[PDB]
User: Which sequence fits this backbone?
């Protein structure tokens, strides 16, 4: 925990991976 | 019987809000496709409606928590991944050098969100950096959630 307010980018990439994976295919 | 956990589900409750344009709590072909291209894609309405029609309960063109949970939960149910981190990083930075400057972050933020200012982005980015260089690096993201 270097700084505060990290959850942001976390959900950001999570959405990127889930959207790209869900939308297209190939889980994980 | 079995569903996502506090962390997994959490990202889900939040996703549904980030996915949609206004946060209707559900994803549609218009929202799904929108974000898709917002990053660096160019799919058709067919793949959006088709994919959604296969996961949508009533198949009206939009997914709901109940149908989404079993779908994403049955296929996924773990913390972040090395692929997601790096992949998401490749799509964030325009040069893929690993450093996401507010210019890029804000661009994607407003793209999927509503409207973001230079101060909010720089405030979110600078406050994110460990040493503060004006942008975010991989080591920053990892350290942000995990690492030391
Ligand atoms: Ca909407
Ligand atoms: Ca529906
Ligand atoms: Ca860069
Ligand atoms: Ca730095």
Assistant:
């Amino acid at each position: 925990t270097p700084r505060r307010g990290r959850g942001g980018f976390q959900r950001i990439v999570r959405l990127v991976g889930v959207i790209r994976d869900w939308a297209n295919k190939n889980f994980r | 019987a079995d569903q996502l956990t506090e962390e997994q589900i959490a990202e889900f409750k939040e996703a549904f809000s980030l996915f949609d344009k206004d946060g209707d709590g559900t994803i549609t072909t218009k929202e799904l496709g929108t974000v898709m291209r917002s990053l660096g894609q160019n799919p058709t309405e067919a793949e959006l409606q088709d994919m959604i029609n296969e996961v949508d309960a009533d198949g009206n063109g939009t997914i709901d928590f109940p149908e989404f949970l079993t779908m994403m939960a049955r296929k996924m149910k773990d913390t972040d991944s090395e692929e997601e981190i790096r992949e998401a990083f490749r799509v964030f930075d325009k040069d893929g050098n690993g450093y996401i400057s507010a210019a890029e972050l804000r661009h994607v933020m407003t793209n999927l969100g509503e409207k973001l200012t230079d101060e909010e982005v720089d405030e979110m980015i600078r406050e994110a950096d460990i040493d503060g260089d004006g942008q975010v690096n991989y080591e920053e993201f990892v350290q942000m959630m995990t690492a030391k």
Q: What stands out?
A: Residues B 93, 95, 97, 99 surround calcium ion (ligand 3) (CB under 6 Å).
